[PDB]
Amino acid sequence: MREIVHIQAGQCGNQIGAKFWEVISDEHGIDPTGSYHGDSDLQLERINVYYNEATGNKYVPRAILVDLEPGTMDSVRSGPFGQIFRPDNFVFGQSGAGNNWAKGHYTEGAELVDSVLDVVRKESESCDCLQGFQLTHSLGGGTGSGMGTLLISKIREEYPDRIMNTFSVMPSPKVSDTVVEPYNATLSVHQLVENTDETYSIDNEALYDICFRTLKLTTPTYGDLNHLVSATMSGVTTCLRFPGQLNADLRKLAVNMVPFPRLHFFMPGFAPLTSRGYRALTVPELTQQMFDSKNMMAACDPRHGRYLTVAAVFRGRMSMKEVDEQMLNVQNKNSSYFVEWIPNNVKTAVCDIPPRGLKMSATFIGNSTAIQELFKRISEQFTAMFRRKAFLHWYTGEGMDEMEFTEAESNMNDLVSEYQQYQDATA
């Protein structure tokens, strides 16, 4: 445990993956060239978790950029920070995955996958002690969906002893109009259940509704949604990047958050919710907000379920007494929403460095049984098409069988049944 290898696949993966490096680069005082220009040495104490230090004391992100089309990666290379990334670490195709999981996993992705793994291997070599892997991707497309999950499976074969963690973007009919998305998403969940240690369920429905109802953006863009995603990614990784006691590594996080191996889908939360365009928040406000439904990055009502485990990260200069007071107040005021059979399931961290333009923030990470709502949604949409076998030719024309679909459908339905099991479980 020390170094994290980051992989970003497909359009969504590369867009959110790019925004991630831009945000934490500024946080750790690294300019678009890779040169350090910060005020604190707290910025470099754990820099090697995400960055490789190179000759002439220049910091290179330990990032692999994957896609089955050049498009997005070209705009990432043309972008502000595209210069920070190692150019040998840009692995792309020309075909595209055409929003088809079968193309990303079996046909087109199959052709590119070993070139990615050679870059994964090279990065893994330059590691004194590799922790595991981080992947950004959407579950609704073809590349990040199909290729991303095949890359996880292949990485797991070569590194079975390491931690596999993902930032998976869930589809919403409010953001996308690609009919096949529920199919790709169910095929991807089946993979995530088996092969990941931790998954941050980033839901496009919740990101859209936050932008519309709370940020009062009439016509939200992808960059608006990605702004909330980059804030969430910066917050959920804090403990890994800065000196600290709680969840300072991927494994310690998993042991605190995962009571049952399939139940590793986290509902991230964030306070204050902001749009890209003064008024500081009190420790009590940060606490009410981070636990509020309106601040969740997954379109689930936490009050409809029970928390199995919670991680709370507070960023900035505040009272550790008051943080502790408010955290205990939240648990003691709503004790029914926290399983009694997992004693002291809420663990809190406080980090002195806040994000850009915020005096203070709070990031929540919850393993709530209410995540079954997101899975019931994708399941409702999948079953509606699959019971009439609609749009399957796109998949069977790639060599897949109805069996894979029936299996994926079953595993996700079983996962929803498991989350219910522990919601109705008493001590």
Partner: protein
């Protein structure tokens, strides 16, 4: 898993090949049934006409039979 991945791409290839094959076969079959049919139609037409010529000789011979 690596086995099933291999099996799936192989099934994609065989179904595509079987498709090009069946198409090639259907066309060869149709262009031969049509060639034989059109030829048989012209043949039938010209025998009917050749028998009209045969009959005309029978008429010219029946005329010369009186002289």
């Amino acid at each position: 898993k690596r086995e099933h991945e291999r099996e799936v791409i192989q099934k994609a290839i065989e179904e595509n090949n079987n498709f090009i094959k069946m198409a090639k076969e259907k066309l060869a079959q149709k262009m031969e049934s049509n060639k034989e049919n059109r030829e048989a139609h012209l043949a039938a037409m010209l025998e009917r006409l050749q028998e009209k010529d045969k009959h005309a000789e029978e008429v010219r011979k029946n005329k010369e039979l009186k002289e």
